[model samples]
Target: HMDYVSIRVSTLRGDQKIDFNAYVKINDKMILYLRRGDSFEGERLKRLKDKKLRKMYILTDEENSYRTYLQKNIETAYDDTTGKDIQTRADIIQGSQQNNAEEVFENPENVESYNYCKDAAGKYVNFIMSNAQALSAVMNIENTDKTISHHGVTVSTLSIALAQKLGITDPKKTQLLTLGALLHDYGHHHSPLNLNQPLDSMSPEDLALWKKHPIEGAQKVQDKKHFDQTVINIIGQHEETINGTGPKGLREKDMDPLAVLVSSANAMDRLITFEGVPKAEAAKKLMIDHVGKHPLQHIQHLNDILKGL
Candidate 1:
């Protein structure tokens, strides 16, 4: 019976020398040190009586028991009043939805369980507008292969927010922009080639097929009713370049505002380095260097309009 109650730091044979000093050091750093073995003060009683302890000795009598209580409950510590399990909450929000894309996006109002991404999109937009510093900080995190999805989502969310903040005025247009941004890469899942591989090594036929995703994604949108035409245009023309070398070589003049916004933002997302460079620096070195020197005439004006918000 005593075997279950008794706790031993080391076995009799001494498997290894335990470093009490190092353990103490770590414990102290974590605010777990106990000064002496003693009873705890009735702190709750003091609080009820509206009394504050004047003598430090009053803390000593109750400290060890408090420390013991702390050590036992530390892993399970929770705010009783709120009664929320933080880890569970995170799991719920981060977990993938069971519904298909069409069900989630088309009937968002009716689909109560699939609202996390929608809520996240709203939070992202509000964050960028209200807190430029937060946006800049997030932009500074390096994009690893593991973090690419998160970075993509952040970029799309920010682009949608920026467009809405830039006096789009029409609520439907703003929502379309947000939806278009979110689903811009939806067709990529159906692509046959390895998308993560460099484009230079890909064959002409593979490249041709790869370029059709935007148009295909636009077709996919046709099944869902109540979606704006702007969404279809943005989805279809997101790959079109300013120089008209895009799929079917669509000219810049032929492009609509939504198409331009989606394409420009997608290009910037692909080009920008989120680790350290500022937005301006990334634009000059990566975007212009890659696309050309006419960055100002291309998309900078649209970005400027977004900056005001």
Candidate 2:
């Protein structure tokens, strides 16, 4: 008789006790999976994984408690003494952020939604800061998935890393950059557009819709005063090329440099994700295909980073 928000089941580590009750929805009924204090054993974990069941439900009212639980496990996973390894910790972070993305997208109008996303991005930054190899771990997990939900985290993770390499390590800037990366494509699913057709093949009307995406994305949160203007600009300008060739016709000199970072990451991830380009090869390809459109220096750094991976 209550409402619930879904959570990614992968975030629940096998054999670890959970603090919140979880349920699985079946035939429109919420079936109890475990009560609080029960260990989510490896056996149950494997079954869920084997079946590819990624989501479970918890009362919407308990979401904060669940997030708290997830954050502490992130702490344990990141600690080397805990024996969880880098990739495992990386997966947990990705799953939690992915879950958060699902929630934010569900209610972009809510100022509170922005708060959770900002918090998720902050947690991600902390994770990267705590480990030397954290960026690669997070990006690798992001690259393995093929969806808008995963794309946000993928670009934001790389954008933050790019900022680190470029000496824009200030959290003040990067946190906003993180939000930008995470929400850059918010217009796609929210607005009417052709996602499946080739860009060249689209009719002028369809292409127009595609071009409107960035503007519409930025507009969604422009009313929410808590949303940083920088974040809003990134959401709008991510599609804009460095040369005055983008939808809004803003040139690199006129655009925020931070937006350029997300633009480069957005282009790079799409190449690897859509064209089946190898991560290492995508950087070189990006340099060739987008010499002046994106920041070549940023692409160069992206290439070097992917090669390091």
> Each prediction's TM-score against the native?
0.51, 0.79
RMSD (CA, Å), each prediction: 16.9, 4.1
- The sequence of per-residue lDDT tens digits that candidate 2 reaches over residues 1-309 is 688988877577534567778998889788888678875433344434434355789988889988888778767765656766676677667666766676677777777878978877887877777788877777655333355667888888888778888999787888889877887888885555635344556799988888998998888777778878998899889989988888999998889899989999888887777556778787777667666778777888888777763
Cα displacement (angstroms), candidate 2, residue 10, comes to: 6.4
lDDT of 1 by residue, 255-301 (tens): 76766666766665654433343456545643545464223433564
Give the runs in model 2 whose Cα sits over 4 Å from its true position: 1-5, 8-55, 58-71, 75-83, 142-145, 190-207
Candidate 2's displacement at residue 297, Å, is 0.6
The lDDT, on a scale of 0 to 1, for candidate 1 is: 0.44
Clashes (candidate 1) = 3
Model 2 score (lDDT): 0.75
Clashes of each: 3, 0
Off by over 4 Å in 1: 1-123, 140-143, 146-152, 161-171, 197-201, 273-282, 285-309
Local distance difference test values of all predictions, in order: 0.44, 0.75
